Write an enzyme that holds these catalytic residues in place. Structure first.
Site, PDB file in Angstrom:
ATOM      1  N   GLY A  59       0.856  -1.171   0.000  1.00 40.71           N
ATOM      2  CA  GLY A  59       0.000   0.000   0.000  1.00 40.71           C
ATOM      3  C   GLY A  59       0.892   1.221   0.000  1.00 40.71           C
ATOM      4  O   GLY A  59       2.058   1.125  -0.383  1.00 40.71           O
ATOM      5  N   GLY A  60       0.415   2.342   0.521  1.00 40.15           N
ATOM      6  CA  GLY A  60       1.116   3.595   0.313  1.00 40.15           C
ATOM      7  C   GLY A  60       2.518   3.506   0.889  1.00 40.15           C
ATOM      8  O   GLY A  60       3.474   4.022   0.309  1.00 40.15           O
ATOM      9  N   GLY A  98      26.402  12.221 -27.855  1.00 40.46           N
ATOM     10  CA  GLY A  98      25.995  12.918 -26.652  1.00 40.46           C
ATOM     11  C   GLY A  98      26.640  12.291 -25.437  1.00 40.46           C
ATOM     12  O   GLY A  98      27.076  12.978 -24.513  1.00 40.46           O
ATOM     13  N   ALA A  99      26.939  11.005 -25.530  1.00 42.38           N
ATOM     14  CA  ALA A  99      27.360  10.277 -24.350  1.00 42.38           C
ATOM     15  C   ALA A  99      28.599  10.965 -23.778  1.00 42.38           C
ATOM     16  O   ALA A  99      28.755  11.043 -22.560  1.00 42.38           O
ATOM     17  CB  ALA A  99      27.665   8.831 -24.698  1.00 42.38           C
TER      18      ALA A  99
END
Lengths: 345, 353, 176, 176
Positions: free
Chosen positions: B5-6, B242-243
């Site tokens: 759950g949360g 870009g690397a």
């Protein structure tokens, strides 16, 4: 081989052999007799042994102008690296004369930008050495801009991390301005020249003959210009003063001055009295200031600065009790201990 | 022990998680429910057990043999970090011996002449490290990239590097997910990041692209320009696209960039770059054109596929012999140790999510 | 997506008004595999962080942790408003009863559903609505929907300025 | 006289519009001995530091260092404009040549003196202009002389905003 990894390292040794060697042996030989020492050399001396780190060691000029590209010598005729003086962090450059007559270039200006930023960023003093001929003619205004980056920096620092200027070589044109900004100038007799405008022009307009040592030379600046802090007998001397001056300073505006704590003698020591009697009974007579300062810095030591210029007053810093201190006093001996503009400034 | 759950969310915020194999569980929702709800039956371990986070979510930092162990990992991991982001990481100072050791040399020979062949970055990270210590975070996830803690000269330092060995050592969204946090976490607590760089490309994909490479990679480029801690980098070898900007490049602002001769940094992979550059000529003469295309390829790799073309500008601070690297790392640190840096005041910075 | 929009609006000083009718969170094997556990959290963190005025209103069922995630006061929102419609829970009444009463439900196998349905009714009837939460002060008021615009326009007037502070750090560690 | 003023402007936030015609630095021995390097250098100091809006128009020759000292981008001025007329160069073409071709110029006894004249023409043609600068971006705009007012005006409106940051100091060490 060449494709291969063993080879790829090998090529590297081979470039390294090259970049440290940028002038001809013939540029080098000529300097050496002159009475003075190359940029790697100047460096080894200032920075404690083994300490040194290269930067932009491989960096080489992007030019087109005027054949310039023909030779693209590694390190752009500056050496810039960070080394430690006496175990305190330092950031350094030496101008290389052999190369381009130690003219300034876009890469050469940038080289310096890397060093000055390393320093503002880190918070350590930069001792910069120039033997720089002038601003390299070929580059064109690019040179003129690179200078500017340097000025602009020289201001934004000044008063956060200490700047010490070693001039061992002629500076001409804008070059002058950058030391002018730097907190201290140390320069060497008969070897170091600084000038805003060259001799040849003054004669052309002002019809004044001049000598170089006279117009720009180390003694002249020191006494008459009153823009030169120090004059040193020789190149080993000029560096030695630099180690000694720095000792005095903090790494950056945000520290205390480095000090070696020592306990003082409270007791009114025998030398101490020599004071009562230094003053002469009549008021005309002059008596040395320097003795009064001596009595009150540990070990009776004064590092004088600009002794030549405005003798009216002595300016130094001496350590009391292992914390560094600085001295402004009047000097009867010379011109009756008065104020004057050379002395206020 | 299971958390559901949360709650799962509180750990999520937390800088590190450790989970213990086939004793711990984590889940947003239960197995009985997805099954009524979606129609896919799943088991408890299969749904979100220690192995599954560790590899597949990329939410679980570490897996531990047994609780006695996990705690130990918890203790060792603390040691790296500062009590709080005012103090620096505790360093028990030990002087280094520069004098190059046999172990340094090993570097000269780690790189293998083949362009294709791999090496385990793990040998190169250790060589830098005190006692060949490296403590690994999230090994399980996106191995291609290895994130670590380490000490030198006694002051703790933190690792981002390419691993060739896994998935060719190139970038993938999971990796940028993994490192980028990790840089931020280090910069947060004042811990120096040492980055070792050998990236060919970021995984090509039709799944790589959808899932959000464009948003997610960025974080890594954002984490590096953001950080104010001393950042020092080594390019082993592969630099491409870009690397190169992206791992810990001078561009972002990193202080010392160091490159091995072996290392190549380039716009594009050469095979690639030539096509586009000479597209005109290989086409011209389309017989005895094909052979021209590889033989040209050699003109371009030979010339443009090493560090200096970069170094010459200065993008790279130094090009050094591979053993050397340990040496650069200690003197460098020593200098950067006091580093400080400035920006315009803002409440927070909107790093892309 | 919402989480960015929150961090971003927060950056520039823009008040966020949030409407929550979330029953739970998506159920998928894929949703936990991908890592909903990291990814979803960014949302709590964004509202937590945010120093711009928050007003949150709940128009229909808010169940579970999801209830907190959406500008719940607990995270830090200044005003929270609930309609008579809005239902706030730990879980849907259905499970909700399953768990509380499970032993009772085995009890008397006869009339299993009837007892089970009756109960599933007692629970929604008396829980699944604002007031329980209102009592607490979790939500400032339950205010008729017609008055909803009146509540936002006023609440802005007061909150426009509001200011908050916390101990300094270079940057956050929000999960990516 | 200017460096004091540029600092005086700056203290009170009065944007400086600085207009350039410099041919160099006055020659003469009195000027070095009196001390030029320490006194002049102050301007460079005044300008790099200032935090008020800076707009610089070339209208005249800008040769040698003087180009930098006079409110150039390089100090850091936000905007820079030059007229077609404006010549920016490391030096006078007249000095400039002799130094670059110096050798080219010794070898014949005659066709030597006229030659220098051609050359000084060649360098003025290609090197004495605003544009060589524009290409780096050393200067933002080349604009016509009537425009110049248009540019000062929009340029002021934009700058009205500007602020910038530098590392903490008690005072600077500007040369006196």
């Amino acid at each position: 081989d060449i494709h291969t990894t063993a080879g790829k390292l090998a090529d590297l040794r081979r470039r390294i052999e090259e970049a440290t060697h940028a002038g001809s042996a013939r540029a080098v030989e000529k300097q050496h007799a002159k009475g003075k020492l190359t940029a790697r050399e100047r460096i080894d001396l200032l920075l404690d042994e083994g300490s040194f780190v290269e930067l932009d060691e491989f960096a080489r000029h992007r030019s087109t102008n005027f054949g310039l590209d023909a030779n693209r010598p590694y390190g752009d005729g500056v050496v810039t690296g960070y080394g430690t003086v006496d175990g305190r962090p330092v950031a350094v450059f030496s101008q290389d004369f052999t190369v381009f007559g130690g003219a300034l270039g876009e890469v050469y200006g940038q080289k310096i930008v890397k060093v000055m930023d390393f320093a503002l960023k880190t918070g350590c003093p930069v001792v910069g050495i120039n033997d720089s001929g002038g601003a390299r003619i070929q580059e064109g205004v690019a040179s003129l801009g690179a200078y500017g980056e340097i000025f602009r920096r020289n201001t934004h620092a000044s008063g956060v991390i200490p700047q010490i200027s070693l001039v061992v070589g002629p500076c001409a044109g804008g070059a002058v301005y950058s030391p002018a900004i730097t907190d201290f100038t140390v320069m060497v007799d008969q070897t170091s020249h600084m000038f805003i405008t060259g001799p040849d022009v003054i004669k052309t307009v002002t019809g004044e003959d001049v000598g170089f040592e006279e117009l720009g030379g180390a003694r002249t600046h020191n006494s008459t210009s009153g823009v030169a802090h120090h004059m040193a007998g020789d190149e080993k001397d000029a560096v030695e003063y630099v180690k000694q001056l720095l000792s005095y300073l903090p790494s950056n505006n945000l520290s205390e001055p480095p000090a070696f704590p020592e306990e003082a003698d409270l007791a009114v020591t025998d030398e101490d009295a020599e004071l009562d009697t230094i003053v002469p009974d009549s008021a005309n007579q002059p008596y040395d200031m320097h003795s009064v300062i001596e009595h009150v810095l540990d070990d009776a030591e004064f590092f004088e600065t600009q002794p030549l210029f405005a003798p009216n007053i002595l300016t130094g810093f001496g350590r009391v009790e292992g914390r560094p201190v600085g001295i402004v006093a009047n000097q009867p001996m010379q011109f009756a201990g008065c104020l004057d503009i050379t002395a206020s400034e | 022990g299971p958390c559901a759950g949360g709650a799962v969310y509180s750990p999520a915020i937390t800088d590190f998680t450790v989970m213990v194999d086939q004793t711990s569980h984590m889940f947003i929702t239960g197995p009985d429910v997805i099954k009524t709800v979606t129609g896919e039956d799943v088991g408890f371990e299969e749904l979100g057990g220690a192995r599954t986070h560790n590899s597949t979510s990329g939410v679980a930092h570490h897996m531990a043999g047994d609780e006695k162990d996990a705690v130990e990992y918890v203790k060792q991991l603390l040691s790296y970090l500062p009590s709080n982001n005012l103090s620096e990481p505790p360093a028990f100072p030990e002087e280094a011996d520069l004098a190059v050791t046999d172990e340094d040399a090993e570097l000269d020979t780690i790189v293998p002449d083949s362009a294709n062949q791999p090496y385990d970055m793990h040998s190169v990270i250790e060589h830098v490290l005190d006692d060949a210590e490296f403590f690994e975070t999230q090994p399980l996830f996106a191995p291609n990239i290895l994130t670590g803690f380490g000490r030198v000269e006694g002051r703790p330092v933190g690792i981002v590097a390419n691993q060739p060995m896994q998935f060719a050592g190139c970038l993938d969204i999971t990796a940028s997910e993994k490192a980028a946090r990790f840089v931020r976490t280090c910069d947060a607590f004042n811990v120096p990041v040492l980055t070792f760089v050998d990236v060919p490309g970021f995984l090509p994909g039709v799944d790589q692209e959808h899932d959000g490479i464009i948003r997610r990679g960025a974080k890594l480029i954002f984490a590096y320009a953001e950080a104010t801690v001393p950042l020092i980098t080594v390019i082993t070898r592969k630099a491409f696209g870009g690397a190169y900007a992206v791992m810990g490049s001078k561009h972002l602002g990193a202080d010392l960039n160091l490159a091995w001769p072996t290392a190549q940094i380039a716009v594009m992979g050469a095979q690639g770059a030539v096509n586009i550059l000479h597209r005109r000529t290989i086409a011209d003469a389309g017989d005895d054109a094909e052979a021209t295309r590889a033989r040209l390829i050699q003109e371009y790799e030979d010339a443009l596929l090493n560090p200096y073309t970069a170094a010459e500008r200065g993008y790279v601070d130094a090009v050094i012999m591979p053993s050397d690297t340990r040496r650069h790392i200690v003197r460098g640190l020593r200098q950067l140790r006091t580093k400080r840096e400035s920006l315009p005041p803002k409440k927070h910075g909107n790093i892309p999510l």
